[model samples]
Target chain A: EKVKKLDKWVPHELTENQKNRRFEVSSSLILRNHNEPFLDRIVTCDEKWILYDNRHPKKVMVTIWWSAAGLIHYSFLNPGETITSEKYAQEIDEMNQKLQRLQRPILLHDNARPHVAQPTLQKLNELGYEVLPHPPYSPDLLPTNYHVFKHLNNFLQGKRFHNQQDAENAFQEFVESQSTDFYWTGINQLISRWQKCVDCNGSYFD
Target chain B: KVKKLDKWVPHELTENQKNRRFEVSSSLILRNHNEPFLDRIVTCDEKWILYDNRPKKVMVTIWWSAAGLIHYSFLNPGETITSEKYAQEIDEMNQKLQRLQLALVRRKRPILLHDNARPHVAQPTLQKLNELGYEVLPHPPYSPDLLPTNYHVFKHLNNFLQGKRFHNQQDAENAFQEFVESQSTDFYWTGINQLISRWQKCVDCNGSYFD
Candidate 1:
């Protein structure tokens, strides 16, 4: 008799509709970027909440935008501060300005409320950014989540900061230390993940 | 910003705290029957208008009564309330009540129902409430389920705000105002009316946290 095995855990219990949507989006993205220098033109952004120290723990919200070349921009929210649509739009403008030397860029971000809000969309449209479609509950497809953050977490492991400034300085150093190849590798990993997403029928895969 | 010596768990009510909750709930229930107090309550609370997940948010403080929302304010970005700021808000609330000249305010002092946050319990806040001659309801710590704002008002308000996006603070404020105005008078009454039953439930549960 054949032995049976337990099924692997997934981040989200996706519905049939969600799985179909993810498959469609992943396939379309893969097709559009194929045989094109599209990956280099893609600028992806994400936000994370980071804790500083364990004994006297404090959290800070950080937002980062990166391309294949390297980290383009990053900023920290003041304690108790949160991003609104207006604020997020302004951040996009700042990122665009910083990327003036580059070609017309494509923006990839999640469907977070602020990212999908009317004002943020309007700003993106005005800037002529080609916004990528990211399905809900699909963190595995995000390079920032699946690749960059893993490396970042490893780099900061067992480190303690005395204050928020210390943490910020350390984070800046980490970003500066990474070579362009590091970022390029992370962006290239996205293509394989997109293919895997399609192969897995939109279900999450390791 | 004086922190308590002992770690405090919200739902882990001590015998002393439970007794206070029970006694206060029973007394309030008695007052409601004797002279009709629910209609005179001006309950207020603070909530965060979350624009997205986690860090993207805005704080709002609201004051309302059985009639409707009396006043509301959005804290500036990155601002958190202190005792002094709360006292000023109370003063502003009194001014609004005076201008409206609600019968409740004109005939008798309106009871203010709020939670036991540090800002609310601070000396300056209490002194302001006393100076205004408004009766402050004794609310048990960590009892958000008892507050109409928590259990009722904000629940509907959040539902309305969900899936919607705002351009800026002004846009968010406009949406919030629309939500408050859209609520029927019965909506406000129903929220306040639930207090009697909630208090009775608290007493019945011996001050344990309940739905």
Candidate 2:
């Protein structure tokens, strides 16, 4: 599995014996670090919803919900839009809509911010949203914080947004192209596995 | 720990009553599905070696990896990156690097991440990774078509954040820990596992920040 490009060095590089030493070091390091699949059911996710605006290019605002299933649910608030109680209310409505459409009481596992707000808390109760009380400094539990929208930059790269319209168009395309069952299934499955990890009394950084 | 409150069913209502009702309902719903976590390894990180004005040519860059528990490696910049790669780009490049490396390792069994693309990491720097010691290509951008984070991490995080309480830092902190403690192992690292090659991809991909 190791591809050693060098057999022996040229006279300028090293003697035959010297060449072997260099090759041995690099080879061992490469062999020791051979590709190993990082397996574990860590519900990896992060903060921020990937948003597109008119004036500013694609912006990163802390928004959206990421499930282990990876069924991406976006927010009504654009990036940087202050998450007021009103906004949280709207978000719950959106959640209801998504759930109603999908059918099932959606279990939301996110940070403490918006959900902890007095009004926001009340609103979620009124509308009936399941909010997981996430731990402190544990974006790793959340899959999006790990890799969700973090995967979107390349198509977005190199294109200069002439205006908000340009950015919005790109964003629409981004979302449009993003719909898929395979990925979403993987997301759901990841979280389902995460639940198992929890059941096993996993460590703090399992 | 469910609270009872006055709801505006027939008579009038107070602000406190309204808040209590909200808390009780959401709490039950959240806890009903919430699992008690065993560990915290979810992460999201982005690196940026900055130019130090402190009269030193300090690597001047920093990688901010967040949400390590819910996510895998918070802020993982794929393989090796130039100073230019930021959020999303970093995720993609890292993902692409993973895919490319996975292919070389397992080659036949293609393992993908089930989550979002970190927008914090930038790109082109990914495509320009020809110079680094790592041997891999940048993950295709917006390739929910190919990437799994879009489906897995992003989806789950969304579910996690929905109806979140807009609490202050203290409140937010409590909510976060509650969430961490509530999730199940299935929420941590479930499935039969993708493959050892995929783990190898972390090393080959050099890990988002912490492989």
Candidate 3:
């Protein structure tokens, strides 16, 4: 046998406070959802940058709102546009309309500046959406980052696009073609990720 | 109030790798002593420019000397860089050097400093450099601390582009060009100049990471 060093790469260096907060929030979330069938009605959303060959902007942001059942809605932001608090609030309004929920929807999104802005919080309160607590810098716990987009990125790898419309068509096809089990797997993975966070003392894990 | 912790580095060097780093750095320093070294060196590196938001990333490769930027090119979307492509880039860079009369000014073959990525070290890329009469500087693997492009140039470029929004490719390109032009000659000089001390520190620390 030979001697070797043991180390791992992490996305960010978490402070003690950040780790503690992540651990606490993950434990509480697991505890709260342990008895409830809350995962089914959860509406998760994220923005991804989609690249295209012939598009003027070269790339555009595609904001997708999804559930375990399937997609609720997705919108492509205009070239040069970003998701400001006002824009995010408007997108939520559009998502809410498309949702037509029979049960209370639990909203899940990351701690992007606009996502946590006062206007977004106000809009969520007005809509009576139960916003889930997400720890900062924890992409491994987010289904979009760790699961859905993981597959989506694989699908997009080495694929060229002629224009914005072509890219949008491809993404829509990807969303539609995915089985219900695909989405369920993403949602189901969230629980195990949260549990892993607690187990790792909130350190990032692959 | 906050307490400071030791900064994290990209990799932990093996004892053998550490010895390699020290040996390579010492050799470079020895090589530099006999010639107009820093000015004749052209450092090249790649960075991803994210437009407007978190994920609107575009890969760009750049070449610069102690004077300033010489050339920069964006990778086409969805196109992975290969050895052939890298060889073509080296040809393009040589053409730019000729056009700028930078080769004439140096009066010596340009010493190329770049990381040992797969595309960079492939036989075709090595053949291209040999054909162009460019001298390759020895660079230790996993030592970004020794690269001025990594430790200095991109650090400032990142700061310049932070929180900035771009509408189109032209917009982002213009913004990037503006940032490159904004830096003074001394700024570029300082980046390359720091390499001397950085290499020395590599020797001093027995090839461990440093600020």
Candidate 4:
């Protein structure tokens, strides 16, 4: 027999609670910056595992903070290395120094415990940064996954790497190769996707 | 932050590890495919029979052969399928098998296939299977989507259960039992017998679980 695809129409199953919070975030975004360059002020952040081999691969977790400027700051954690609250604080601290702007970039990340822990929050607050509201379970709302990494993944596909360093080199090359317009376009989509989600009362972009 | 469904391949498994699973399962199929083992093999598994009302879930343990459904048992909501409980359940299943054997006693000992869940591989559970004069099949470690129950029976069983709202335990039990009884003898056999084809596929894939 040959392969087949099983298709079904599932009526976008979004929970009531998730819908409410999504509306709240969208409303808050508009309320805080009625007519301002919020996209430029936003610095979305996330992390993912990069495999070093196809057969017996060693994986590394990379946490990245980026804005309309292709890349900002990134940290690589080797296999088994953990991100503690202190470690997250240090990452933000370094990013804060690099982003030395007149206005603090609006920090946007999920509610992972390390990101929201007391120490990390204090670090963000002390660094003179305003954190944008991020609704739980809304990964699609992130520019990193929806915009940046989707392109990054396509660029890196079909390539092979020998070690973590080689993988890192490839990643650096990819990030650096992206034009300023690429970052702007990715950051720009977050606005419309959030609007689309809010248009459906916080479900997802249809 | 709002919730989103993110389907991910688990990072814990490596490509090499997956290839080895295919290898192990393939080798197992090559050795046993020619043996007249399908009819003699008794496969077993456990799952939660859930209800919509006050009794949220009941643990249902089942044992079956290619012939058809043999026997199934249930445990109370808070009760676990511990080593002791698993032993008792197996013994009860054995009594049913004993009746099937009595009609025409078969000389060939039954083979057992089950996952390496901690309760299953517990010393007591292993001893009981040994005592029953059945040789257990060696299951590969950390292989998901490879179990007979997981890939075969439970998927369909759970599909039948989707959107089914039972008022209480008795109502749920009746529904589950009726569903099990409604399956054709060929259906059960096909589900159990598909393992042979799967084993061959694994060998063809050179031990990749993805194959």
Evaluated at residue A158, the lDDT of candidate 4 is 82
lDDT of 3 by residue, A21-140 (tens): 566556555654553347886889777778885214488778888888888889998787666877788888889988886226777777445454545654665565756666656667
- DockQ scores of all models, one per candidate: 0.01, 0.13, 0.01, 0.01
lDDT of each: 0.71, 0.36, 0.71, 0.66
Candidate 1 residue runs with Cα over 4 Å from true position: A1-11, A35-37, A54-57, B1-211
Q: Give the interface RMSD of each candidate.
A: 29.9, 20.2, 28.6, 27.4
User: After superposing candidate 4, which stretches have Cα over 4 Å from the reference?
Assistant: A1-206, B1-12, B52-55, B105-107
Reference contact recovery of candidate 3: 0.00
Identify the candidate with maximal lDDT. 1
Residue A84 shift from truth in candidate 4, angstroms: 39
- How close is every model to the real structure, measured as TM-score? 0.46, 0.34, 0.47, 0.46
- Every prediction: chain A TM-score: 0.88, 0.54, 0.88, 0.85
Q: Per-residue alpha-carbon lDDT of model 3 for B55-79, expressed as tens digits?
A: 6667778898887777898885588
| Candidate 1 C-alpha lDDT tens digits along B13-84 | 665466446545654665455347688789988877866421566788888888777889999788878888
Candidate 1: DockQ?
0.01
Task: State chain A's TM-score for model 3.
Answer: 0.88
Report, for all candidates in order, the number of backbone clashes: 0, 187, 0, 12
TM-score of chain A of 1: 0.88
lDDT over C-alpha atoms for residue B170 of model 1? 74
